[PDB]
Enzyme design. Structure first.
Site, PDB file in Angstrom:
ATOM      1  N   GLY B  30       0.766  -1.225   0.000  1.00 44.38           N
ATOM      2  CA  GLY B  30       0.000   0.000   0.000  1.00 44.38           C
ATOM      3  C   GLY B  30       0.802   1.283   0.000  1.00 44.38           C
ATOM      4  O   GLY B  30       2.026   1.287   0.131  1.00 44.38           O
ATOM      5  N   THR B  31       0.076   2.382  -0.169  1.00 46.84           N
ATOM      6  CA  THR B  31       0.628   3.727  -0.168  1.00 46.84           C
ATOM      7  C   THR B  31       1.446   3.926   1.102  1.00 46.84           C
ATOM      8  O   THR B  31       1.221   3.249   2.103  1.00 46.84           O
ATOM      9  CB  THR B  31      -0.517   4.759  -0.188  1.00 46.84           C
ATOM     10  OG1 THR B  31      -0.926   5.001  -1.540  1.00 46.84           O
ATOM     11  CG2 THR B  31      -0.097   6.043   0.476  1.00 46.84           C
ATOM     12  N   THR B  32       2.401   4.848   1.071  1.00 49.96           N
ATOM     13  CA  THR B  32       3.206   5.096   2.261  1.00 49.96           C
ATOM     14  C   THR B  32       2.532   6.171   3.130  1.00 49.96           C
ATOM     15  O   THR B  32       1.895   7.098   2.619  1.00 49.96           O
ATOM     16  CB  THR B  32       4.661   5.516   1.879  1.00 49.96           C
ATOM     17  OG1 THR B  32       5.409   5.819   3.065  1.00 49.96           O
ATOM     18  CG2 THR B  32       4.653   6.725   0.990  1.00 49.96           C
ATOM     19  N   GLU B  47       0.755   9.597   1.499  1.00 47.77           N
ATOM     20  CA  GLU B  47       0.885   9.688   0.054  1.00 47.77           C
ATOM     21  C   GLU B  47      -0.456   9.313  -0.578  1.00 47.77           C
ATOM     22  O   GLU B  47      -1.072   8.330  -0.187  1.00 47.77           O
ATOM     23  CB  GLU B  47       1.976   8.718  -0.420  1.00 47.77           C
ATOM     24  CG  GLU B  47       2.010   8.493  -1.919  1.00 47.77           C
ATOM     25  CD  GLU B  47       2.993   7.422  -2.342  1.00 47.77           C
ATOM     26  OE1 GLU B  47       3.128   7.196  -3.559  1.00 47.77           O
ATOM     27  OE2 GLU B  47       3.634   6.799  -1.471  1.00 47.77           O
TER      28      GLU B  47
END
Lengths: 102, 244, 241, 198, 233, 244, 250, 243, 242
Positions: B30-32, B47
């Site tokens: 997943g997104t950070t 993010e």
């Protein structure tokens, strides 16, 4: 003890003409010997060309009208926007009322 | 034998719960997102990959508030994240209702902890596919936390999870070393915007959108609030500037 | 608590548990029913895997649901008890609310419904039973004969048979039963029934029981002799040729 | 209340039940049969609360018939009365008890003896030579205490009842519109259609 | 691999995937195309109705949820009925209890959570349908995309279903243009029909084949079918 | 999920047979043999105690013959514990009947109720069936002396002589060979012992390996009497019949 | 959540065996030996206190438990399973008997209750059988002294004397040699100690052996005086010292 | 068949693999702990390891205060450890409410052991991968140490150790008691008992400790508390002025 | 095993698809709608000459203005019919009017997907989908004569004409060419009789086939054997005419 009912006064009148109909009602709302409001609508346009007034204990009248208006809304949702004829509204109201028979 | 990884609450011969471990994979994919504990509050940044120009900018908010003093951000399966926050909200409301005082961050952390750990106790449920960073201010300071799919959590000075967790953690460690005295809410907001930018290299392919929120005793009065307008751009620039 | 879907569809569109339920019926002793012009007869065969039973008490194959209707079956005996009890209860309930006993079709439709329900409810397997239900509607003289099966399907028959070797005995009936002239007598009706069973019972005076049902709750079961007498007259029709 | 009487003679049990059904100021029916046959040799009469009365009678009838079919046997009079007593005893402690009193007259084909059981709505059961429910008992128990004899024939029993009905038609305030009489013996249950002047 | 981890929604694969959810998403792709786009005054839904035979009807794909909200479906119709019905109730609750029209953004959150529950529990199945939600609330025109995974996103425009990719690239191109079609519904609709036709291939949108729905500033969510869409073909 | 570990104890085989019932029956076939013989003036129940030891207390033991009523008793072949669960509910059913009708329960009604309970474990619930087969010996004023048998399937039948458990095939052939309608209790007692004597998988047939019971209507009285023989009593009847 | 395991975990296999019960018995086989011997005026049950570490306090772990003042139990197999069984047995003696008749249950009936609990873990949904075999010794007015064995299946049987667990086969053989219907309680205690010695590898003393008896009433263990009909419990655990005194006369 | 290794049912050898694998999890944290009884106190020592620099050292612990008098140290993954701690607290609070007195250390232990036995018998519940050591100065029994494992087993100890190097610590303690001949540290102050504890932890593990490598919990009449880094440093100093 | 509500890799529900296969093995059912009414015809398909064919009820009345024909596991249709009858009667009680044909159909279809072993969405207690498809025909003031095809999938399509059962692919082709917006009720009748005759293994007669229709004037009626016999004769004649 607690009494769930109250009397808000008011008077309503309905006359049917050959190709029209009227539902009238005073706009005064009372409690005992005081006036709560000199203008508190009591007759409503519920859609599909139906007007209605539930007079007596106002909280109950409002709950009913509100429930019927919502009934019309769902009638459309469940029957391809069919118009709710006055006779069908009447039977519908009977079940709403008898639902609280006790 | 094998098959120890097909059912959630099963212990493998080496004492592991493989389904939880697979849940982690969903998180790393997943997104950070990060969190930074400052001298009187905490900052949250994440993010937001711009799938296309069609995404209305600034509209798909990811950071969520719990009660009025807690912020939560997570990486992994977004729906699982919302699910966990809804629970946190019911959990906080319940605590306030009985004790009057809004729920302390440590107390809140365990509520999420126990709930998440509970989802590793039966094969009738799946573990959570998110690592959650959350915290806020309370009767005695600021607190930052990170909760893993296993239900494991600890208090942090700084924390990151998601695709670029390594870059982030590297950056966070520098900050920790170069500021033993403590960063400030104002500073943390910028520093957070930078780390998100740096950590965006592990996904430099797609364009993104920055999102920050914070809770500072002095800057927000102990209430969780989102960073918007001027303070936001000022942080965006501070990043764009140090990205070169 | 237990609600596992036991009866489910397979790729070819079959529900194997209902299908296997039928296999349990094929394995059961044979049962047959033929309707006369003024009666309906029900015949069943008696296994002989073990013989030393007490015929007085051992549960019989033909069961009265009410005073004007009977039910026989082929399949799991234990399962049949469940269906019979529910039928008997529904019969009394119907008399209680409609103030009139059940028609044979009504009672059949009820048993069939119970069977169908057990084919699509969680946690239960279908009844490994098929039934023949016969009798006379209240104040009616027209004979009734119906058949139900595990799936819940039902229909009326001039004559039908279920159970092991029912294939054989049905053939017999299909080329021995004339709808133009149904067994105009209780006697010739019982004879056609015994003949059909002999095609598979292989000499069994004590291995063939029969029950005669006439209008207005007139139901009686024949004794060994009465039956044995029919067998006798039957074996002569053969030798006299 | 309605008149419910029962008398057990030598080889039969006779039940007499008033024919009137009155509500308020009006006698709505004068040919009401306050009885239900539970089995070929067992009869039950009843009096009490307006709707409970028949609902109970029919519910009991349904159960006995079910047992008969299931067992292809007829329960003895004593067995049926015990079943009825238990039902009433459960009812008295329920939300809305059955307010029904009954008389169960049956001929026990195994013992070859008639039997009369009196049971009130509380589930109070007693076996008697003669019994009654309601105000009737107040004039009939002493009448029968005087005229009743063990070895009486069915015909003597009927004359004994006639004596009872006449007393009731003389001293009771209400017009119960006569009674329907039924005899229960070794041959079943039959109704004496001629009591309007026997 | 997969075959061992796609038996139910309560199982993660070795890489962190949920195959049952992904298979449900596949039902959408197999569904007929539908498009959504909004300006600042209106939001429009254009959907291609699919038919079984030339003797059958073209199954409706647009459901009205309230005077200010509605959606288009792609995939299992029954699942759309369920979800839209839940949406109708949530809109209803908001009005009756708070005398407030439900915010499209909230409607999206509610749907996301309802779908999420069928992806973490045993016995249930994910929903097999995609939805495009349009509405006008206290913050203008809105368009949401709902995926069975529970993911809901707000966009200026988008499309789902078979060959949806065509219409989607078109909108991503026409963006600066239609986003300004304010005060002119007919234009927004036409811009929608043009986007949708970018996914045609089989045939061409006919009268009893095209379905359009609009909502806006002073336009209660209304659905146009047949002769009503003729002037757009 | 759980479905994975469900054996599905209530399904049909492709041949229309019930797996668990068939397997439970297989279990029963290894149980000590129990025999029931009905005579004109009584009924005899005899059973072989499977496995014994010098230290086993036979005076306080009972693993096969149980009293259900004062007019009904059963012989068990299968899991003793399972049998006890059923025996107890049978005892309760008999008392409910007595309380309801003020008459002892007819033998068949009681047997049918018990058989129905067994039938249930066969059609719903997902539980294993009871690994038990019973031989019921009882008396009522409608059918007099009666002998019934029920097994895991819930099916039941009446007999003049029957056996359950191990070597029933051999036992049945022997019984069908010497039984005679006009037998007498004492004749039956002897027939029962002889049969067990020829079917036993043991060296000899001693008293410490038997349980005996008879239901007679003691001429000097007029009522029915059940008699579960005591160790010594079995030893006696054992010598008399010529088995010593 | 919610236990969705509503089906049996013990089912019949084609051969007719009930696997889980068989396996439970195998667990009992690996368990430490325990035995029980019935005398004319008492019963003795004993087992080895196989301490799992010299740092552990073997006294804080009792393998021999009082169920009622006149009934005791010992076991072989899974200790934890036994512990919960004892809790349930003590309670069922109250709920299903003392609270109804105002007196403790006779040995056979309480054994019957325990056996029932164990049989249910053999058929109920979602559970496994108990991995233990118990030896229950007791006394009651109308039955005198008795000794019972209850196995994982729920089956139970009365014994004059017996042993379960690890070296039960050898121990039983040894008991058959020394047992007779005239043994006095002290004699049984002595034979019990001898039998247990063959099963113990290391130290054999009042601190490594756990032994209790069911004998005469112990008014001194009642806790009060003033009621003639109340003479005290018949169940008594021997002290480490009492055991050693008898070991010197081994 | 091969599923007798996924849920808690018997294997043909009468074994419960899931319980054995649960035992394996108890060492996943690679931490060792030990407990000793003083004259009138009880001390529990546990290594404290905080590898990540981004962690707040103050929130990393495996010692818990269950009640005013009971302390519990856990060997195993933190989530299961916290699951166990919350339950024990609730159980201890309920006991006091219903029975009117403080739940004894051994009773709480039996209770948690029973709860564990259940996960061992019911298929839908997994065992917790932890070992719990409970301590207190019971009003009736005095200094107490009771430990429970994933098998539902529990017993009282004179002293005990738990973790990867449990055996080394155990034999060390065993040797000390074979020598002293008494079943406790004959010291009047808990400070010295804590010093004895740490001293032997070092001897057995062959390792030196800073004030942040340990975690200490102490139990005294009517109270159980944990030491601060500074309280420990003071302890480490004391032992240093002996070697 | 595998859940009863599992998706295939193609995005389909196994149980529903397999359900459709069972419906293929069913007897043929055909419905044709005209501005003069809707005709419903079915293949009795008795399995033995001893079976009293008139006890085969594959065409049932839902209400005076709504009729129904079934195909597949017909025993599965009973609860559906019961639900429909109750919905139609109930609607009339609540609204003093007739239930619209579409509404009635939608109600029946709401039962469809209510199957599973604990699907998180309500309380779907039904172990499997129905193994029968239905043809629902009727008339109402707003949309006149209508024909719907209700499947176990829960989806219902409206058709001018439709065929379900073993001979559907073949019969549907026929209906494609034969149907036109101006068919008369009589034409529709012969047309149903004709196509049934083509797909049926047995020679169509008034005993192994049955007709019915629904007209605004007289409602749903099931043609008695004599009436259909004549329609059959009339068909044979028009066919032989060229």
């Amino acid at each position: 003890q607690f009494n769930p009912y109250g009397d808000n006064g008011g008077t309503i009148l309905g006359i049917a003409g050959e190709d029209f109909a009227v539902l009238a009602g005073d706009t005064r709302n009372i409690t005992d010997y005081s006036i709560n409001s000199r203008y508190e609508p009591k007759v409503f346009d519920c859609g599909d060309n139906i007007v209605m007034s539930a007079n007596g204990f106002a909280a109950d009248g409002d709950a009913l009208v509100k429930r019927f208006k919502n009934s019309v809304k769902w009638y459309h949702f469940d029957h391809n926007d069919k118009k709710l004829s006055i006779n069908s509204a009447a039977r519908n109201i009977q079940h709403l009322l008898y639902g609280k028979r006790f | 034998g094998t098959g120890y990884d097909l059912s959630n609450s099963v212990f493998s011969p080496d004492g592991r719960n493989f389904q939880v471990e697979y849940a982690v994979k969903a998180v790393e994919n997943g997104t950070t997102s990060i969190g930074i504990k400052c001298n009187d509050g905490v900052v949250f940044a994440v993010e937001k990959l711009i799938t296309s120009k069609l995404l209305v900018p600034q509209k798909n908010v990811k950071i969520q508030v719990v009660d009025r003093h807690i912020g939560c951000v997570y990486s992994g399966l977004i729906p699982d994240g919302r699910h966990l926050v809804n629970r946190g909200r019911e959990e906080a409301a319940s605590f306030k209702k009985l004790y009057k005082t809004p729920i302390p961050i440590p107390a809140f952390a365990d509520r999420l902890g126990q709930y998440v750990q509970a989802h590793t106790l039966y094969n009738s449920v799946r573990p959570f596919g998110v690592s959650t960073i959350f915290g806020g201010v309370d009767k005695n300071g600021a607190h930052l936390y990170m909760l893993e799919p296993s239900g494991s959590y600890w208090g942090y000075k700084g924390a990151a999870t998601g695709k670029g967790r390594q870059s982030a953690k590297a950056e966070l460690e520098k900050l920790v070393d170069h500021h033993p005295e403590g960063l400030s809410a104002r500073e943390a907001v910028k520093q957070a915007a930078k780390i998100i930018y740096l950590a965006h290299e592990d996904n430099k392919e797609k364009d993104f959108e920055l999102e920050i929120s914070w809770c500072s005793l002095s800057e927000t009065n102990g209430l969780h609030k989102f960073v918007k307008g001027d303070l936001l751009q000022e942080a965006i620039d501070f990043a764009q500037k140090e990205i070169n | 608590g237990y609600d596992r879907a036991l009866s489910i569809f397979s790729p070819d569109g079959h529900i194997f548990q209902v299908e296997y339920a039928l296999e349990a019926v094929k394995r059961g002793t044979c049962a047959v029913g033929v309707k006369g012009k003024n009666c309906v007869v029900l015949g069943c065969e008696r296994r002989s895997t073990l013989k030393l039973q007490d015929t007085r008490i051992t549960p019989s194959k033909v069961s009265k649901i009410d005073s004007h209707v009977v039910l026989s079956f082929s399949g799991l005996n234990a399962d049949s008890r469940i269906l019979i009890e529910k039928a008997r209860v529904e019969a009394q309930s119907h008399r209680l609310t409609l103030e009139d006993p059940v028609t044979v079709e009504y009672l059949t439709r009820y048993v069939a419904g119970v069977q169908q329900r057990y084919t699509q409810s969680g946690g239960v397997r279908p009844f490994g039973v098929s039934t023949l239900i016969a009798g006379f509607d209240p104040r009616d003289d027209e004979p009734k004969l119906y058949q139900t099966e595990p799936s819940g399907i039902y229909s009326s028959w001039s004559a039908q048979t279920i159970g092991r070797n029912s294939k054989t005995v049905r053939e017999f009936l299909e080329k021995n039963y004339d709808r133009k002239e149904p067994p105009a007598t209780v006697e010739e009706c019982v004879k056609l029934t015994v003949r059909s069973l002999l095609e598979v019972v292989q000499t069994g005076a004590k291995n063939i029981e029969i029950t005669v049902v006439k209008p207005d709750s007139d139901i009686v079961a024949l004794s060994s002799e009465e039956i044995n007498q029919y067998v006798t007259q039957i074996e002569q029709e053969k030798q006299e040729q | 209340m309605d008149i419910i009487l029962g008398i057990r003679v030598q080889d039969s049990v006779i039940l007499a039940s008033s024919k009137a059904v009155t509500r308020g100021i009006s006698v709505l029916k004068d040919s009401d049969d306050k009885t239900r046959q539970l089995s070929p040799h067992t009869l039950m009469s009843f009096a009490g609360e307006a709707g409970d009365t028949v609902q109970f009678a029919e519910y009991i009838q349904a159960n006995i018939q079910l047992y008969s079919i299931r067992e292809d046997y007829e329960l003895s009079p004593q067995a049926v009365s015990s079943f009825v007593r238990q039902e009433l005893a459960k009812s008295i402690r329920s939300r809305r008890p059955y307010q029904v009193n009954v008389l169960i007259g049956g001929y026990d084909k195994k013992k070859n003896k008639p039997e009369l059981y009196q049971i009130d709505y509380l589930g109070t059961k007693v076996e008697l030579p003669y019994g009654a429910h309601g105000y009737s008992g107040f004039y009939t128990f002493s009448l029968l205490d005087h005229h009743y004899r063990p070895d009486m024939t069915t015909e003597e029993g009927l004359d004994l009842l006639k004596l009872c009905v006449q007393e009731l038609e003389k001293r009771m305030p209400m017009d119960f519109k006569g009674v329907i009489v039924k005899i229960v013996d070794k041959d079943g249950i039959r109704q004496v259609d001629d009591f309007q002047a026997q | 691999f997969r075959n061992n981890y796609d038996g139910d929604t309560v199982t993660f694969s070795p890489t962190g995937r949920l195959f049952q959810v992904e298979y449900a998403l596949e039902a959408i792709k197999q569904g007929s195309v539908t498009v959504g786009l909004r300006s600042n005054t209106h939001a429009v839904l254009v959907a291609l109705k699919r038919n079984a035979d030339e003797l059958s009807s073209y199954q409706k794909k647009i459901i009205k949820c309230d005077e200010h909200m509605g959606l288009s479906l792609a995939g299992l119709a029954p699942d759309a009925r369920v979800l839209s019905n839940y949406l109708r109730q949530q809109c209803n609750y908001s009005s009756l209890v708070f005398n407030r029209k439900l915010a499209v953004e909230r409607a999206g959150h509610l749907l996301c959570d309802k779908a999420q529950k069928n992806t973490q529990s045993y016995g249930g199945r994910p929903y097999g349908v995609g939805l495009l939600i349009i509405g006008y609330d206290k913050s203008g025109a809105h368009l949401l995309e709902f995926q069975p995974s529970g993911n809901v996103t707000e966009l200026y425009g988008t499309a789902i279903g078979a060959r949806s990719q065509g219409a989607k690239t078109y909108l991503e191109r026409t963006l600066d243009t239609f986003i300004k079609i304010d005060g002119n519904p007919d234009e927004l609709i036409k811009a929608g029909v043009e986007a949708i036709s970018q996914s045609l291939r089989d045939e061409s949108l006919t009268v009893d084949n095209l379905s359009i729905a609009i909502v806006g500033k002073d336009t209660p969510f209304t659905i146009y079918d047949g002769e009503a869409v003729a002037k757009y073909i | 999920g759980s479905r994975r570990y469900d054996s599905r104890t209530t399904i049909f085989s492709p041949e229309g047979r019930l797996y668990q019932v068939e397997y439970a029956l297989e279990s029963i076939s290894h149980a000590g043999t129990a025999i029931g013989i009905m005579a004109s003036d009584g009924i005899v129940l005899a059973a072989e105690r499977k496995v014994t030891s010098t230290l086993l207390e036979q005076d306080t033991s009972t693993e096969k013959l149980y009293k259900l009523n004062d007019k009904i008793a059963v012989a068990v072949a299968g899991l003793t514990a399972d049998a006890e669960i059923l025996i107890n509910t049978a005892r309760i059913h008999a008392q409910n009947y007595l309380k309801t009708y003020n008459e002892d329960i007819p033998v068949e009604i009681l047997v049918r109720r018990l058989s129905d309970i067994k039938q249930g474990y066969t059609q719903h619930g997902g539980l294993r069936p009871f690994g038990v087969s019973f031989i019921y010996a009882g008396y009522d004023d409608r059918y007099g002396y009666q002998l019934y048998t029920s097994n895991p399937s819930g099916n039941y039948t009446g007999w003049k002589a029957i056996s359950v458990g191990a070597n029933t095939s051999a036992a049945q052939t022997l019984l069908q060979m010497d039984y005679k309608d006009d037998m007498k209790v004492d004749d039956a007692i002897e027939l029962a012992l002889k049969t067990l004597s020829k079917t036993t998988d043991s060296s000899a047939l001693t008293y410490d390996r038997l349980e005996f019971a008879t239901i007679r209507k003691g001429a000097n009285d007029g009522e029915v009497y059940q008699k579960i023989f005591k160790p010594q009593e079995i030893k006696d009847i054992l010598v008399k019949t010529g088995i010593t | 959540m919610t236990d969705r395991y509503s089906f049996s975990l013990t089912t019949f296999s084609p051969s007719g065996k009930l696997g889980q019960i068989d396996y439970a018995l195998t667990a009992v086989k690996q368990g430490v030996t325990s035995l029980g011997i019935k005398a004319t005026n008492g019963v003795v049950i004993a087992t080895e206190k196989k301490s799992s570490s010299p740092l552990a306090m073997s006294e804080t772990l009792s393998k021999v438990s009082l169920l009622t003042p006149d009934i005791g139990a010992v076991y072989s197999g899974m200790g934890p399973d036994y512990r919960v069984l004892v809790d349930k047995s003590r309670k069922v003696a109250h709920t299903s008997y003392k609270r109804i008749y105002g007196e403790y249950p006779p040995t056979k009936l309480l054994v019957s209750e325990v056996a029932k609990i164990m049989q249910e873990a053999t058929q109920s949904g979602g559970v496994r059988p108990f991995g233990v075999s118990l030896l229950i010794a007791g006394h009651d007015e109308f039955n005198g002294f008795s000794l019972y064995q209850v196995d994982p299946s729920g089956s139970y049987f009365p014994w004059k004397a017996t042993a379960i667990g690890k070296g039960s086969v050898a121990a039983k053989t040894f008991l058959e040699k020394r047992w007779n219907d005239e043994l006095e309680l002290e004699d049984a205690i002595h034979i019990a100690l001898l039998t247990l010695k063959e099963s113990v590898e290391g130290e054999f003393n009042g601190d490594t052996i756990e032994l209790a008896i069911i004998g005469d009433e112990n008014p001194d263990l009642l806790g009060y005086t003033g009621i003639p009909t109340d003479k005290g419990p018949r169940f008594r655990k021997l002290t480490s010292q009492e055991i050693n005194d008898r070991l010197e006369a081994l | 068949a091969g599923y007798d290794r996924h849920i808690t049912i018997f294997s043909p050898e009468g074994r419960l693999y899931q319980v054995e694998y649960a035992f394996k999890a108890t060492n996943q944290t690679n931490i060792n702990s030990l407990a000793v009884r003083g004259k009138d106190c009880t001390v529990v020592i546990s290594q404290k390891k905080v590898p990540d620099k981004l962690l707040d050292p103050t929130t990393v612990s495996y010692i818990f205060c269950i009640s005013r008098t009971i302390g519990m140290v856990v060997n195993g993954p933190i989530p299961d450890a916290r699951n166990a701690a919350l339950r024990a607290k609730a159980e201890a609070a309920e006991f006091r409410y219903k029975y009117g007195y403080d739940m004894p250390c051994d009773v709480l232990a039996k209770r948690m052991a029973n709860l564990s036995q259940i996960y061992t018998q019911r298929a839908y519940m997994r065992p917790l991968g932890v070992i719990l050591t409970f301590v207190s100065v019971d009003e009736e029994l005095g200094p107490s140490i009771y430990k429970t494992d994933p098998a539902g087993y529990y017993v009282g100890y004179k002293a005990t150790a738990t973790g990867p190097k449990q055996q080394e610590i155990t034999t060390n303690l065993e040797n000390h008691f074979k020598k002293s001949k008494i079943d406790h540290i004959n010291e009047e102050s808990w400070e010295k008992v804590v010093e004895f504890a740490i001293t032997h932890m070092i001897d057995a593990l062959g390792t030196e400790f800073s004030k942040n490598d340990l975690e200490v919990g102490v139990a005294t009449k009517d109270k159980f508390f944990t030491l601060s880094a500074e309280n420990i440093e003071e302890r480490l100093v004391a032992i240093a002025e002996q070697d | 095993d595998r859940g009863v509500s599992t998706f295939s890799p193609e995005g389909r529900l196994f149980q529903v698809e397999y359900s459709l296969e069972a419906i293929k093995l069913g007897s043929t059912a055909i419905g044709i709608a005209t501005k003069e009414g809707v005709v419903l015809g079915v293949e009795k398909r008795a399995t033995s000459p001893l079976l009293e064919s008139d006890s085969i009820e594959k065409i049932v009345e839902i209400d005076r203005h709504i009729g129904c024909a079934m195909s597949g596991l017909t025993a599965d249709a009973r609860s559906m019919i019961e639900h429909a009858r109750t919905a139609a009667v109930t609607h009339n009680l609540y609204y003093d009017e007739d239930i619209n044909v579409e509404s009635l159909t939608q109600s029946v279809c709401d039962l469809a997907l209510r199957f599973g072993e604990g699907a998180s969405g309500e309380e779907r207690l039904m172990s499997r989908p129905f193994g029968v498809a239905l043809l629902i025909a009727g008339h109402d003031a707003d949309d006149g004569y209508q024909l719907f095809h209700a499947e176990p999938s829960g989806t219902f399509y409206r058709y001018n004409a439709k065929a379900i059962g073993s001979g559907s692919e073949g019969a549907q082709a026929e209906l494609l060419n034969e149907w036109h917006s101006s068919l008369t009720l009589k034409e529709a009748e012969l047309l149903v009789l004709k196509i049934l005759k083509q797909v049926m293994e047995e020679k169509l007669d008034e005993n192994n086939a049955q007709l019915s229709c629904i007209t605004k004037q007289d409602g749903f009626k099931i043609y008695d054997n004599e009436k259909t016999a004549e329609l059959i004769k009339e068909l044979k004649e028009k066919e032989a005419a060229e």
